[PDB]
Amino acid sequence: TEFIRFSGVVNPRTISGSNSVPSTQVADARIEYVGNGYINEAQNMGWLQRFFLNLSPM
Amino acid sequence: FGNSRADMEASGGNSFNGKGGANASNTFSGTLTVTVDQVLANGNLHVVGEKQIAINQG
Ligand SMILES: O=C(O)[C@H]1C[C@@H](O)[C@@H](O)[C@@H]([C@H](O)CO)O1
């Protein structure tokens, strides 16, 4: 599953025509596009590799 | 000058070369909607804004 969530503050004067406003005109833009399942799990580093990345010298 | 008493031969050289340089460039091509923080005495507005984006894995 994919979750696309948006949050922000919109001035009720930049809304143009068909109730549409570009995200660049929204203050406090919070945009999340996350996924689940093994497809998302395959994009995680892995505990040992993450530890080496954060601690291993060079 | 009967012998090599006056016979003379000499050479000398002195070469020096120094160089130096430095560069610094930066670019930014975004658009961000900010919010007023306070109104100054002269009418200038203190604007602060923030936007968080979670594409995936970070
Ligand atoms: O007239 C001199 O004073 C010289 C003539 C060269 O021969 C010179 O080299 C020296 C030599 O050392 C004598 O042994 O003598």
Keywords:
part of a larger assembly; 2 chains; 58 residues; alpha+beta; 2 helices; 24% helix; elongated; Flagellar L-ring protein (chain A)
Strand order of the largest sheet of chain A: 1-2
Number of strands of chain A: 2
**Structural class by helix and strand composition of chain A:** alpha+beta
Radius of gyration of chain A: 19 Å
Specify the helix fraction band of chain A. Answer: 10-25%
PDB class: membrane protein
Keywords: bacterial flagellum LP ring salmonella, membrane protein
Entry title: Salmonella LP ring 26 mer refined in C26 map
Chains A, B: Flagellar L-ring protein
Description:
The structure is cut from a larger assembly and holds 2 copies of chain A (58 residues). By secondary structure, chain A is of the alpha+beta class. Helices cover 24% and strands 29% of the residues of chain A. Chain A is elongated, with a radius of gyration of 19 Å. Chain A binds chain B through residues 9, 24-35, 40, 43-44, and chain B through 31-35, 49-57. Strand 2 (27-35) of chain A pairs parallel with strand 3 (52-54) of chain B. The structure holds ligand TLW.
Helix-strand blueprint:
The structure is cut from a larger assembly and holds two copies of chain A (58 residues).
Chain A: E1 2-9, E2 27-35, H1 37-41, H2 47-55
Antiparallel strand pairs in A: 1-2
The structure holds ligand TLW.
Function (chain A): Assembles around the rod to form the L-ring and probably protects the motor/basal body from shearing forces during rotation.
Family (chain A): Belongs to the FlgH family.
Organism (chain A): Salmonella typhimurium (strain LT2 / SGSC1412 / ATCC 700720)
